[PDB]
Amino acid sequence: NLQTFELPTEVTGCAADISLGRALIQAWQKDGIFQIKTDSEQDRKTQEAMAASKQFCKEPLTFKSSCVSDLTYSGYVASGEEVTAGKPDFPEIFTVCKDLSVGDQRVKAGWPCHGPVPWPNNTYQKSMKTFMEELGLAGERLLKLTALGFELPINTFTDLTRDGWHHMRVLRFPPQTSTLSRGIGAHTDYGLLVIAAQDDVGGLYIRPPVEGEKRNRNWLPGESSAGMFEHDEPWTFVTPTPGVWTVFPGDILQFMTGGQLLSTPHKVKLNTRERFACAYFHEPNFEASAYPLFEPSANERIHYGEHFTNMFMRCYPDRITTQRINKENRLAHLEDLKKYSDTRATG
Ligand SMILES: NC(=[NH2+])NCCC[C@H](N)C(N)=O
Ligand SMILES: O=C(O)CCC(=O)C(=O)O
Ligand SMILES: [Mn+2]
């Protein structure tokens, strides 16, 4: 039975906010996840996104597959195209990353992963942008509350999310048609928070913290979390519930908190009906470096954009986006922009 919280519209640092932050942390530490109650506008925007997704997925595969970019990972992923732990995943996906035209300086400079979303049409665009604006407001509330719960300055995490690399996976899982029930293999997501919505069908499972269990640090190339614990209990079924979004930590929160929070492992099983879901990632700025909050003498850092880029390359080894990164050596520029950027987001 997951906890459900209603968040205040604004987080100011009053005693109630600090208390709520404590409760959110405790719920993550016990269950790995909690629910936040949605209001009528949050719910309306969620349902309109789900409807736009259903309409897009009915389009011919050739059209859907045309919604791709060799500059950004935004756009369509066919069923069986994404790889997790060396195995194909089943959903068809539309990924929405920061929507930057070729007029944006970062795109002109060839920064990896920067470019325009290949929207299927302008009504889908509007529905997703409106939904993501609402999701971002919730992400910011959550980050202020989390800082307060850890007795940190209220802006500790939001100082890293200005022009944050927020993105979303808009998913349709097919019904199970073969002996394979795997929708998406076990994995952790990459940023600060994951805020997710699902329809009535059901299929998401999450792994709570387990006392004494070692957790891989998925930001390290020798400790990928993909596939870990796939067939070992415990896995908590996330029961579809009207009027909520779920929230769990990603890799950056695990790193920054030194494991006081864990990036929640999760997986999806195919059901007897198709299943629509949306997973939103509230992320640092592409140029931000995460740091350990509770060990100021520690030298380890995560350059967020580098983590994102490495992850998407491992998800999509053969996508035109990955090919162009390799061809133009755009990972090198990612090392360069660490020291010669002009965006003023850092330094
Ligand atoms: N958040 C994503 N882009 N994908 C989530 C699934 C796991 C991913 N294929 C992996 N190997 O980490
Ligand atoms: O299908 C879901 O409910 C979550 C999917 C997910 O974890 C992802 O797309 O990263
Ligand atoms: Mn995920």
From Swiss-Prot:
Pathway recorded for this protein: Alkene biosynthesis; ethylene biosynthesis via 2-oxoglutarate
Thermal properties: Optimum temperature is 20-25 degrees Celsius.
Keyword terms of this UniProt record: Dioxygenase, Ethylene biosynthesis, Iron, Metal-binding, Oxidoreductase, Plasmid
Activity control mechanisms: Activated by catalase. Inhibited by chelating reagents such as EDTA and Tiron (4,5-dihydroxy-1,3-benzene disulphonic acid), and by DTNB (5,5'-dithio-bis-2-nitrobenzoate) and hydrogen peroxide.
EC number: 1.13.12.19, 1.14.20.7
Record has Metal-binding as a keyword: yes
One term of GO molecular function: dioxygenase activity
UniProt pH dependence: Optimum pH is 7.0-7.5.
UniProt cross-references to Pfam families, sorted A to Z: 2OG-FeII_Oxy, DIOX_N
Names of required cofactors: Fe(2+)
Top EC group: oxidoreductase
Domain (Fe2OG dioxygenase) ranges: 164-284
Protein residues bound to Fe cation: H187, H266
GO biological process: ethylene biosynthetic process
Stretches of the chain forming a coiled coil according to its record: none
Function: Simultaneously catalyzes two reactions, namely formation of ethylene and of succinate from 2-oxoglutarate, with a molar ratio of 2:1.
Family statement: Belongs to the iron/ascorbate-dependent oxidoreductase family.
Protein name: 2-oxoglutarate-dependent ethylene/succinate-forming enzyme
Gene encoding the protein: efe
